Design a protein around this ligand. Structure first.
Ligand code: NA
Ligand code: NA
Lengths: 317, 324
């Protein structure tokens, strides 16, 4: 993995701090923070108000989140600056104590990108619990050469992208901190996910890779959003957050937990909102940035994707 | 600024799967033993051929007339086996010829798969980087080729044909390990009209023969868009001889634009070849296509050796999905 000093941020600290919020606390003085990293086309609240904000509260954490603008549609590398800055802030604000990170969709790619390229946070993240992460991107976007004009981070989550290439070649498809990846073969956004194998976009070597169907059977169906919100997802995430190993444990879940509906402990209103989690993403995409090329890799990542084409041209060594 | 990133594998050479005696048996020099040879040049042949079949009609005599002792490897059977094994023959030969010429660097000159083999060796066997002074590659397929896939016609194909298919685990691993940037001074001579290796048309890093920082000479960029030489002509033409002569003589280790131009754009076999050599040069490809048909074939790409597996995790080879 990359070593040495962290790369410089492209955004000022004040901007990065403005993207971080905690429930009922300031990041500078917070007990048992958990950092929630949202999905493409959403803010922290839109990703987590109906699920892991209340669920982590009941598990004894202070939920905190980042909301990189606009709605996680900008450069994934910029979104990661928000996360790295937040880990640094919440580590100090909790008394110099490691904290867990819990993510949905792109948020897991962001987390692993930060752990790969910003060495200072490896000692500050206790564990990573990623729901439907797309470390390999998704092939459902189609080939890069045919992609319609799309948001910066949508380019970067397209399989074949310079970003996913650089993550892989820098060592980022192996876990860096104890990581659990919960995902679904029936994901309608991120594929391939069907093999229960290293082919899957959510898979990390040495991670606790939990394809729901491997536990629940081939008839179990949860979609991209259900991967975050389901009762099964809650049991796995609870296992990961409590485990002394930092990863979910098979002994903590079984067939009786294979309920695809929103987590039981959510209120009826939260269950409704959780089922409708994905809709704001489309609206943000319609109003959001669009371009005909993948954003350039920042200098710290360019050496890992020589030959790939971004907006400024082919990456050279 | 730019971070520190080792561009290539480092450390000790991976072990060979073949014993030294077997690798030595595949190496021959004209009129000399590798153990005591003056000014060797190592020639690495193309798919479906032996060293003599690739080079008897061209660079064996032409390099002799430039003052070298030509030496070649003939990995069996006819370069159709695992490209990684073919590379063991090349690595061993460099070690032997470096030692047999008094610890003096030597040039490597290749056709077709031979250039992929050379770059694979330089990428994964660090000991040879200080023993090769330059690489002169004719029609190298560092990205493989999109033409004539392994599932065309009979659903089995030679091991090295799988590996030379674009998207293969082998070509993926080479790229991910840093192998599409030159490692020693390299000249790549190729043709937009290559009928075996594509894509080659863009005169840019998209081309299968292109290496970053190399001297990448697409013939049409010098001779015009309607100049035609094929996969074999890329090795045998008079234009190719002028570029190769420049690369071998150059003090930079690469061909120099000053040494060739429009008046060298002769697509026929190199002038200095005898009539018999010119005829054989024009017919270079026929034995290779036939050997591919009669050789080993399988329905899967050979497994990557352990040294290469980390660079193609998630690809599929005969044993299953590649893991580190
Ligand atoms: Na958009
Ligand atoms: Na075939």
């Amino acid at each position: 993995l990359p070593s040495g000093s962290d790369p410089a941020f492209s955004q000022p600290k004040s901007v990065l701090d403005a993207g971080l919020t905690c429930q009922g606390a300031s990041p500078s003085s917070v007990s048992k923070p958990i950092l929630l990293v949202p999905g493409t086309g959403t803010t922290g609240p839109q990703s987590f108000d109906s699920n892991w904000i209340p669920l982590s509260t009941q598990l004894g954490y202070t939920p905190c989140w980042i909301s990189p603008p606009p709605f996680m549609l900008n450069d994934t590398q910029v979104n990661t600056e928000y996360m790295v800055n937040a880990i640094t802030a919440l580590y100090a604000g909790s008394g110099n104590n490691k904290l867990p990170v819990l993510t949905w969709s792109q948020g897991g790619l962001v987390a692993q990108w930060g752990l790969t390229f910003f060495p200072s946070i490896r000692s500050k993240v206790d564990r990573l619990m990623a729901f439907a992460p797309d470390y390999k991107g998704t092939v459902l976007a189609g080939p890069l050469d045919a992609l319609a004009v799309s948001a910066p981070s949508v380019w970067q989550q397209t399989t074949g992208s310079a970003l996913t290439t650089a993550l892989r070649n820098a060592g980022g498809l192996t876990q860096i901190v104890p990581t659990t990846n919960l995902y679904s073969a029936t994901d309608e956004i991120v594929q391939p996910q069907v093999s229960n194998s290293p082919l899957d976009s959510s898979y990390l070597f040495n991670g606790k890779n939990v394809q729901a169907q491997a536990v629940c059977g081939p008839l179990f169906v949860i979609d991209h959003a259900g991967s975050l919100t389901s009762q099964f997802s809650y049991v796995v995430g609870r296992s990961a957050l409590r485990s002394t190993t930092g990863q979910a444990r098979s002994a903590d879940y079984g067939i009786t937990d294979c309920n695809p509906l929103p987590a039981n402990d959510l209120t009826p209103e939260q269950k409704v909102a959780a089922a409708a989690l994905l809709a704001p993403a489309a609206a943000a995409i319609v109003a959001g940035p669009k371009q005909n090329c993948e954003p350039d890799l920042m200098p710290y990542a360019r050496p890992f994707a020589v030959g790939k084409r971004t907006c400024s041209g082919i990456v050279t060594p």
